[PDB]
């Protein structure tokens, strides 16, 4: 329940009509200054192309959302239970990288419930309102609790971007070290420091000060960096044949690429803050660097020791301590039209996960946009949302 | 931030149509079946109804809430940085008891915000939204909590009602009992125990059990009821002259009487249960009691003393647990949202009412000399 207790209805309905890349959000967007805007869907479309195979000879590109008319009146939407919505269309694009072939189509992406005039929705004859919600801000955040059984003092941190996925570390009730990446299963943090290209030598040079780091180190049961990278891609997707080259796009692309991943200027900023990064430099590059990864890493470890300072090589001497003041200035207002946008991204991920595992199992000549394009996880998520 | 993250429209229009017992919501709660259906702003008019001074010598009565046409329109309110406004009237009696004159005037209460079809409020030219709010329901919930100083379990219990003040009692890490009455400031347990009439010997019979009630009382220097009621009223009334009367009054007020106070069936129910209080009988009254408050008592005292059952005197066995306070909740719309700022308003009102029925002569008293509707107008403006 994190809903606002006041909208301005304006904000909102700008945001929505920013989400669907109207003319008007173009024209607002010219007058109060300036080039590169981005629409909402155009952000997402833009976000997840190409998808790829692990080969990777395939890949499969989208673009330039756009709508139809309604399918029905408002009034007509009310007296029959409908829902007042607009057909989505984006442009798809297939390529064959054995060839060089491209296969491009115009593709149908599910009815599109659209705002009226009052700044609501029609779902199924219902007129309904949504709200817009404080979430957490862009930031590393560390915190401490106690197990409910062995009643050992544990801590965490999440590094919480502007947009991308989430990297949880732990200390839990077993003495190890966890690292939690994009939500999915529990892995030892070794495993993702191998990934990154680190020896065993190297982890003990620098974490070699705990032993829970070292403990998880043993206990952990990779050997080498391509060992750990495939591990992480077992977790990530699950029943997909991995490579090397496929689960190294991977990790690239879930921190270290600005296409798919962004701390914001805020979050770049509070990162350097709490960690001690980049001392005399300007915000730049929003995304994760290996700096930032190994330090929160260090910066967990050392809190769990006991510890009240750390300097990371080349950075400056930081306290070390709970952000247990996780409120106040910590939280950020989404509007309607980014709520919308969130929950487009997620069916869009379930379609590209469709779409990898049809690339794997249809004939590359048969195959079109249509022939990989599942709508259906799209349609659902947003079915979810109202 | 406790908003709703979605709306029904015509639930949030309706709840308006509701406050301001508008006809179509009177028709609307006929066909619903709802027998004598009474409006938002009537029900606050009841509540405080009638305004009586300390004496019983005269009394003052609202009724009839309405409204004149409202001032611009949308269009003309948005352009010229209006507030979509309509103003509002009531109906307002003064009775002299003493000679039986009545004296009925039509009050002015302010310019009332008016919602839109689009649900929103255009306040000062700008279109506003009010979302509901997911509220605890009622009852009374006890929690766990560990110091971090000393790594103390601290135990804490809060008395919600659907309508009224809240109550809280706490074990701190000095060992102290201490209650927290309409959100104010923290005073030993001991201070309300006595207030309520309650002897040092009566409290030692009930909760010598308790270590840290016996020295509660002890680091309580307060001596007496009269004593007691005076300190909860500087609490609960800063800068007031604090008299004997007006403190007893204020509790009273606060938990044990209807126009004030309502538990609401499932309050009721859920705090006779979770205190094995009235186990067969049926419920008669929603305001808080006395054996209410001694039991939420005895229950967080016990808890901290790590016990696991307790049996109030006259009363059945109930086990002493915390509550997993996880889901309840209940939705206020933004009607009654509305609601309860008319209320503050409205309650502040009373209070000057009150003063000025002492201070002014009887043969000159007229409603329009008593009301002064500042405090109502501010309580709106804020709101918005």
Same mark, same amino acid.
């Given at each position: 329940?994190?809903?606002?207790?006041?909208?301005?209805?304006?904000?909102?309905?700008?945001?929505?009509?920013?989400?669907?890349?109207?003319?008007?959000?173009?024209?607002?967007?010219?007058?109060?200054?300036?080039?590169?805007?981005?629409?909402?869907?155009?952000?997402?479309?833009?976000?997840?192309?190409?998808?790829?195979?692990?080969?990777?000879?395939?890949?499969?590109?989208?673009?330039?959302?756009?709508?139809?008319?309604?399918?029905?009146?408002?009034?007509?939407?009310?007296?029959?239970?409908?829902?007042?919505?607009?057909?989505?269309?984006?442009?798809?694009?297939?390529?064959?990288?054995?060839?060089?072939?491209?296969?491009?189509?115009?593709?149908?992406?599910? /009815?599109?419930?659209?705002?009226?005039?009052?700044?609501?929705?029609?779902?199924?004859?219902?007129?309904?309102?949504?709200?817009?919600?404080?979430?957490?801000?862009?930031?590393?955040?560390?915190?401490?609790?106690?197990?409910?059984?062995?009643?050992?003092?544990?801590?965490?941190?999440?590094?919480?971007?502007?947009?991308?996925?989430?990297?949880?570390?732990?200390?839990?009730?077993?003495?190890?070290?966890?690292?939690?990446?994009? +939500?999915?299963? +529990?892995?030892?943090?070794?495993?993702?420091?191998?990934?990154?290209?680190?020896?065993?030598?190297?982890?003990?040079?620098? !974490?070699?000060?705990?032993?829970?780091?070292?403990?998880?180190?043993?206990?952990?049961?990779?050997?080498?960096?391509?060992?750990?990278?495939?591990?992480?891609?077992?977790?990530?997707?699950?029943?997909?044949?991995?490579?090397?080259?496929?689960?190294?796009?991977?990790?690239?692309?879930? !921190?270290?690429?600005?296409?798919?991943?962004?701390?914001?200027?805020?979050?770049?900023?509070?990162?350097?803050?709490?960690?001690?990064?980049?001392?005399?430099?300007?915000?730049?590059?929003?995304?994760?660097?290996?700096? /930032?990864?190994?330090?929160?890493?260090?910066?967990?470890?050392?809190?769990?020791?006991?510890?009240?300072?750390?300097?990371?090589?080349?950075?400056?001497?930081?306290?070390?301590?709970?952000? /247990?003041?996780?409120? !106040?200035?910590?939280?950020?207002?989404?509007?309607?039209?980014?709520?919308?946008?969130?929950?487009?991204?997620?069916?869009?991920?379930?379609?590209?996960?469709?779409?990898?595992?049809?690339?794997?199992?249809?004939?590359?000549?048969?195959?079109?946009?249509?022939?990989?394009?599942?709508?259906?996880?799209?349609?659902?998520?947003?079915?979810?949302?109202?």
């Amino acid at each position: 329940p994190r809903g606002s207790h006041m909208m301005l209805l304006d904000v909102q309905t700008d945001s929505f009509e920013w989400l669907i890349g109207s003319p008007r959000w173009r024209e607002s967007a010219a007058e109060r200054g300036d080039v590169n805007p981005v629409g909402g869907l155009e952000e997402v479309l833009y976000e997840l192309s190409p998808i790829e195979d692990f080969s990777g000879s395939m890949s499969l590109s989208f673009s330039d959302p756009r709508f139809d008319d309604v399918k029905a009146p408002v009034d007509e939407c009310k007296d029959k239970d409908m829902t007042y919505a607009a057909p989505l269309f984006v442009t798809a694009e297939f390529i064959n990288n054995n060839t060089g072939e491209i296969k491009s189509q115009t593709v149908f992406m599910g /009815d599109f419930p659209m705002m009226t005039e009052k700044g609501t929705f029609i779902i199924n004859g219902t007129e309904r309102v949504v709200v817009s919600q404080l979430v957490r801000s862009p930031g590393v955040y560390f915190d401490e609790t106690i197990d409910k059984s062995t009643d050992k003092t544990l801590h965490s941190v999440k590094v919480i971007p502007s947009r991308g996925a989430w990297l949880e570390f732990d200390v839990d009730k077993r003495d190890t070290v966890g690292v939690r990446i994009d +939500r999915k299963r +529990r892995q030892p943090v070794t495993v993702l420091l191998k990934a990154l290209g680190w020896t065993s030598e190297q982890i003990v040079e620098r !974490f070699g000060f705990s032993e829970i780091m070292r403990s998880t180190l043993e206990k952990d049961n990779t050997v080498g960096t391509d060992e750990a990278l495939l591990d992480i891609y077992r977790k990530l997707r699950p029943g997909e044949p991995p490579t090397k080259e496929s689960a190294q796009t991977l990790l690239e692309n879930l !921190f270290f690429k600005e296409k798919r991943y962004d701390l914001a200027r805020v979050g770049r900023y509070k990162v350097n803050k709490k960690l001690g990064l980049h001392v005399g430099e300007p915000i730049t590059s929003s995304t994760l660097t290996e700096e /930032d990864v190994v330090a929160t890493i260090e910066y967990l470890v050392r809190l769990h020791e006991g510890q009240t300072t750390m300097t990371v090589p080349g950075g400056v001497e930081v306290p070390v301590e709970t952000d /247990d003041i996780d409120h !106040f200035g910590n939280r950020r207002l989404r509007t309607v039209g980014e709520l919308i946008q969130n929950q487009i991204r997620v069916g869009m991920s379930r379609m590209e996960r469709v779409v990898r595992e049809r690339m794997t199992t249809q004939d590359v000549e048969a195959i079109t946009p249509q022939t990989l394009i599942n709508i259906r996880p799209v349609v659902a998520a947003i079915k979810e949302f109202f």
